[PDB]
Symmetry: D2
Subunit: 259 residues, 4 copies
Amino acid sequence: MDLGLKDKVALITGSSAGIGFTIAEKLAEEGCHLIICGRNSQRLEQAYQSLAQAYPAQQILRLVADVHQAQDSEQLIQDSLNQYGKIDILVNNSEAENLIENLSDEDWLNVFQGKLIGYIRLTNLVLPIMKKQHWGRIVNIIGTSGKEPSPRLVKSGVVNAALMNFTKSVARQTAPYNVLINSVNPGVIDTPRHREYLEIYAKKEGTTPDLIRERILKTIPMNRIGTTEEFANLVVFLASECASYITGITIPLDGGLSS
Amino acid sequence: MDLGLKDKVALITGSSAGIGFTIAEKLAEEGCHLIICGRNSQRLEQAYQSLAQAYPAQQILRLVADVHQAQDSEQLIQDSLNQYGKIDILVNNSEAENLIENLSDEDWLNVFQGKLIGYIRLTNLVLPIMKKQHWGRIVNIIGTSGKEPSPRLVKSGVVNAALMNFTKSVARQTAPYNVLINSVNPGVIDTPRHREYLEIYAKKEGTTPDLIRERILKTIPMNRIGTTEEFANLVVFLASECASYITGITIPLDGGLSS
Amino acid sequence: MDLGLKDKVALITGSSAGIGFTIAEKLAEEGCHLIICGRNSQRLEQAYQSLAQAYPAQQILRLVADVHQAQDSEQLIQDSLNQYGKIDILVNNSEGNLIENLSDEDWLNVFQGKLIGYIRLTNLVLPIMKKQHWGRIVNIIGTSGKEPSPRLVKSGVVNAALMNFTKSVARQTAPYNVLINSVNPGVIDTPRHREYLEIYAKKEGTTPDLIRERILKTIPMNRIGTTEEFANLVVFLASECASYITGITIPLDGGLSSS
Amino acid sequence: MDLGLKDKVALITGSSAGIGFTIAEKLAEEGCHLIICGRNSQRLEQAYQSLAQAYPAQQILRLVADVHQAQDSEQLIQDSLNQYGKIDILVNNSEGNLIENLSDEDWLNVFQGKLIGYIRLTNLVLPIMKKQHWGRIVNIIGTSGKEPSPRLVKSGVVNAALMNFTKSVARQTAPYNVLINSVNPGVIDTPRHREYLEIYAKKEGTTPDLIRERILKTIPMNRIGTTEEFANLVVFLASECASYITGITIPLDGGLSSS
């Protein structure tokens, strides 16, 4: 399937590893030029070298930035536009206490100043550019940062509900400009954070990582943990010319967890 | 129907007028003692005098407080507990630019520091008290402050989605203590704010209030605007002993708007 | 709370036992005259005698009828009208797997039971209620005493259909003050539930106690609901007080929907 | 993007025209062999000749069949298996008011059409796909060219049922890599849509142009979708790339679901 992505410019946040990295790879495979970013300069350079070697014909800009910080986010967009003159695609992809009574005002304000305002801010920054182009795709990754999907995750639940509604509202307003915005909700995907979570959960309980993994597998109807490639495939489809009539929706990519 | 509310202590925020006032009246009718509050001392005194005269056998504490301010909210709960020794019921009931591109970081942070954190904070403050009692009811009024319900209302959409999810999470955690929490989503209810909105909309467009009202009536399947009594009836039911198996849900009270 | 039900005429199907019986009791307590029905004459007579002795001031009509059969359902309504001249309230409460096993005849038989049963009875009472400018229909949308689970395929399909039917009919009948809502029970202690525990335990090779323990850990309130708790909401929805509530489905489930 | 569809065998119902025809075309483009069907031999032959001439390297089996009839549906699958030995993909795409007017026979006839039609065909292909450890079923859940609206009561009930069926079957078949999803079209430019515009305009006493203008103002993208745009998503869901997506319903609607 021709996705119509040749020479499209894609900014993928959180692209030094895991889901974001594989999304960047797949976008490059379809002919996009890339902006990849993250806070960890060492990890980002490894990603950058891997992508440049795998896709020597494609342009790749790497930028160290904290996309939960206003100044870094503003400069990220300015540097991207300076390099490429356009930004066609934005993939928003960014990152303990679970008991309600224990969460203070500062705790909640702190959660809102992370991913929630982070995605809103970056969306706001790219919208004028995409509207000028009459072409944009924004895909919001609305998950739990490698934790087992569960209603117990209270902070992420609130933030993710807010972001799903924001997605609908912005989609409705930007649809007349062919700027489309959708969200994808991962199930259990085999990422570095997921693997780190297996280690952390195995200790709190007194067991092994393989044992915790087996318990997780029982909850997934497919009885298999998803790959980053499986997740990336949908994101790339949504970011394509082929998804030109799809906007304002949230899609679970989860091996049946939602059933 | 005996609602089992005799001598229960109910705190109703935003109770100087409109929905909150009628909820306070109906709770007093069922035998509750009240805490009523609001920022407007003059309006609150009028409410206080009306309730005291209508329900002379019931205790009524009135407190001037801004329930979007942390200190006022903390003191509200402390003063309530000092007066009554218990708080059985909390009704969370508190209050322009609509285009996404025009909304800054400060704008969004400001919206989150209002009703969103306001309801979360007050919930957090009453939970230890209600859990000690093994008896609590929290009803969150999740609406649009007298504006015509519409997907266009972007700020309230995000906040309300967040609050509906928060409701579910807190309900799940507090259910083992018989502390039940639910939300009610008003449709078009005849309140002071609604009537003020008719005036403001009639000017922006060049028409009358009755004309704007007629346009609103066409959107409501019942072809009638709801009364504050109709709204209050459900809130009082949810706050009662009779609703002892109902928690974590959101109920539209809207004359069919959701259909 | 005065529910405004004095002398209202209520038809409750499946009212010989369990949820339906308790709903009938509670409606009589609030001043309704009743029509009760069931397929088994002996069980229906027991219910009638209990209700007639408890509420001798109220009129109670008992009729043997299979409300999944067209002729019986039509005659039930005609007999009710001949007795009372009106029907104010209908509570639809009638009874109700490996996908590859389920044949066409199995699915068609499913649809010719509760699904068309509720639709047909709704159709039969609508003109009565519309001419009154007063009606309440409450659809009980449950699993008929089986513990809620994604595994119950037929009931899931039927119940999804009925929830949508509820919305559609509500929208059409709203201006006639004929209000239609559904209640989705969680786990409620009925004779049917108790029999299901026996059957499931026998099939699983375990004890009813162990099945009950498994169910309880899924419910945030950590207890099974009573028929009185369930009936309270149904009676509220059938009342004058619920005059602005229509087209909605309310889970009554101890928090199961937030688990 | 390589969709991994080379030599896969796809059955598309309702494939003589419109959405079904375009889906068949696009599946052939990605390397599938086809089974196409319809009730009208002349229209089916036209579709066959078009596809056979466009994709002469692919196998195309055309069969006259009424997929709302049990015998025809059973024979369709047997004939398909006799030709190809396997069926990898099924796209369920078959055709499909005042409440008080609608009789039992009307509702039963509704349920004996598309509802049991999709369920039956799913049941027929499941064992084929399960033994392969590879299957994709995509249910087209629309209004068959009528403009989406709460007024369409029968389709709403059937479609709600089918969306739930999708979830239930997905959960059961997931470990066999047999994935089942639904797509809900908004307004798509098909011959059926165009005929509906004519009929609705005639019934309303207005022009097709004015009906189209009314529809366009409901769609945030301010345009009606093409069959190619719709087919793109169906083909993606039918692909190897969608290997972790199951049990979900995706609106393909230009933002209508966020309007």
